[PDB]
Scaffold this active site. Structure first.
Site, PDB file in Angstrom:
ATOM      1  N   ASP A  35     -10.936   8.472  19.680  1.00 38.31           N
ATOM      2  CA  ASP A  35     -11.225   8.036  21.046  1.00 38.31           C
ATOM      3  C   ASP A  35     -11.009   9.059  22.172  1.00 38.31           C
ATOM      4  O   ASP A  35      -9.876   9.309  22.590  1.00 38.31           O
ATOM      5  CB  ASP A  35     -10.402   6.775  21.313  1.00 38.31           C
ATOM      6  CG  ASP A  35     -10.549   6.268  22.721  1.00 38.31           C
ATOM      7  OD1 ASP A  35     -11.646   6.427  23.289  1.00 38.31           O
ATOM      8  OD2 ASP A  35      -9.574   5.689  23.255  1.00 38.31           O
ATOM      9  N   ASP A 220     -16.981   8.735  26.502  1.00 38.69           N
ATOM     10  CA  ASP A 220     -16.072   7.881  25.740  1.00 38.69           C
ATOM     11  C   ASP A 220     -16.522   7.501  24.328  1.00 38.69           C
ATOM     12  O   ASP A 220     -17.309   6.568  24.149  1.00 38.69           O
ATOM     13  CB  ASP A 220     -15.839   6.602  26.554  1.00 38.69           C
ATOM     14  CG  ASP A 220     -14.573   5.892  26.174  1.00 38.69           C
ATOM     15  OD1 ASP A 220     -14.044   6.167  25.079  1.00 38.69           O
ATOM     16  OD2 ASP A 220     -14.117   5.051  26.977  1.00 38.69           O
TER      17      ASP A 220
END
Ligand code: MR0
Length: 371
Positions: A35, A220
């Site tokens: 992430d 992201d």
């Protein structure tokens, strides 16, 4: 670069990409979600209906309690836990072991995913957005300080079971074609970037470019969809609706609620437009663009069914997984920039193709940043 890291990521559509890692001594193997949208390294440390396994501190001779609690609230969900440090390794990654901070998750809410196959999360972003505060050194910083691994990493996410690569410490030239195009990292907290122009099927959306980054824009990998600010999201859906006006879809569809289906192999791809996102370049008044195909924002879920993978946001633009899939993304932390290139596992369409093209002229790119 490194051959041993080439196909080190797995996962299932819409559930994130994960890499294998081991924590403790002896080594406890855990699948950790990759992430770049956060900065905390956290793993399940207590049973949960959705966790097939979890970090048992007690069984690690190298665990060290930091005696501090911790919690992280994501847009999606949140987890609570206890901070500590232990030895960590990435089997299919660099050949090193480092002592990094670890958030042992004791309680969570809408975080873990049923059947995802991952039990932890690796926030690859900067300290500034790390919880409790920027003094909790994120994993990658630790890695960089303790080893010689260069301060750089790249992600090659491939669509479909899913997979891809996370090249730690460099760039693997066999994963992309064409030239790499870099956009400045505006500030070191999220992987913030500045979008200077947007086009749908060639038509400029004609919005004040500040809108594109209204609040901010980040890269992201921890979010599935392409998330756009209210005004922008509305503009696109209107534009995308008109382009596919030949057919009609329930509102729930454009809202990401109910999926659509077509007789297997008859998906009217041609009626869905391509989206071009123009990013700030490395040179004055210069930019470049990356084009997304509908195969990227119409996520697959008898018949061929899909979900509209573009949703509105209240926290700026989010270039999610579906946006990263078509390309080879380079997070050049050392030179504070992010590079894009056509991935070796690019999306297909006989008449269209995803791309990264430059250079382009774009005056007043600084005004695109929000304040
Ligand atoms: C990856 C699996 C696919 N999922 C999983 C759930 C369905 C999604 O598609 C999804 C949808 C939405 C949405 N609908 O908006 C929001 C997130 C999200 O919040 N992701 C974070 C990582 C994460 C993955 C996870 F699987 C579960 C989870 F809770 C969180 C990420 O870090 C956010 N970065 C921006 C940031 C914002 C606020 C606070 C920060 O603090 C650092 C950071 C993920």
């Amino acid at each position: 670069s490194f051959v041993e890291m080439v196909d080190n990521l797995r996962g299932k559509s819409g559930q994130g990409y994960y890499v294998e890692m081991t924590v403790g001594s002896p080594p406890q193997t855990l699948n950790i979600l990759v992430d770049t949208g956060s900065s905390n390294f956290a793993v399940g440390a207590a049973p949960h209906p959705f966790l097939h396994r979890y970090y048992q501190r007690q069984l690690s001779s190298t665990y060290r309690d930091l005696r501090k609690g911790v919690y992280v609230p994501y847009t999606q969900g949140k987890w609570e836990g206890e901070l500590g440090t232990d030895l960590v390794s990435i089997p299919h990654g660099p050949n090193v072991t480092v002592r990094a901070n670890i958030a042992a998750i004791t309680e969570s809410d809408k975080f873990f995913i049923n059947g995802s196959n991952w039990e932890g999360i690796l926030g690859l972003a900067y300290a500034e957005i790390a919880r409790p505060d920027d003094s909790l050194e994120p994993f990658f910083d630790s890695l960089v300080k303790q080893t010689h691994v260069p301060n750089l990493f790249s992600l090659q996410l491939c669509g479909a079971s899913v997979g891809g690569s996370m090249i730690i410490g460099g760039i693997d030239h066999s994963l992309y074609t064409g030239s790499l195009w870099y956009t400045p990292i505006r500030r070191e907290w999220y992987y913030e970037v500045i979008i200077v122009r947007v086009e749908i099927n060639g038509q400029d959306l004609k919005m004040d470019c500040k809108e594109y980054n209204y609040d901010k824009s980040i890269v992201d990998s921890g979010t599935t969809n392409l998330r756009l600010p209210k005004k922008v999201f509305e503009a696109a859906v209107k534009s995308i609706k008109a382009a596919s006006s030949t057919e009609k879809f329930p509102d729930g569809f454009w809202l990401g609620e109910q999926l659509v289906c077509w007789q297997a192999g008859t998906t009217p791809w041609n009626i869905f437009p391509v989206i071009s996102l123009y990013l700030m370049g490395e040179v004055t008044n210069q930019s470049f663009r990356i084009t997304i195909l509908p195969q990227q924002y119409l996520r697959p879920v008898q018949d061929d069914c899909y979900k509209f993978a573009i949703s509105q946001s209240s926290t700026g633009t989010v270039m999610g997984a579906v946006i990263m899939e078509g390309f080879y993304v380079v997070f050049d932390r050392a030179r504070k920039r992010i590079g894009f290139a056509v991935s070796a596992c690019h999306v297909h369409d006989e008449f269209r193709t995803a791309a990264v093209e430059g250079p382009f002229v774009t005056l007043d790119m600084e005004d695109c940043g929000y304040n």
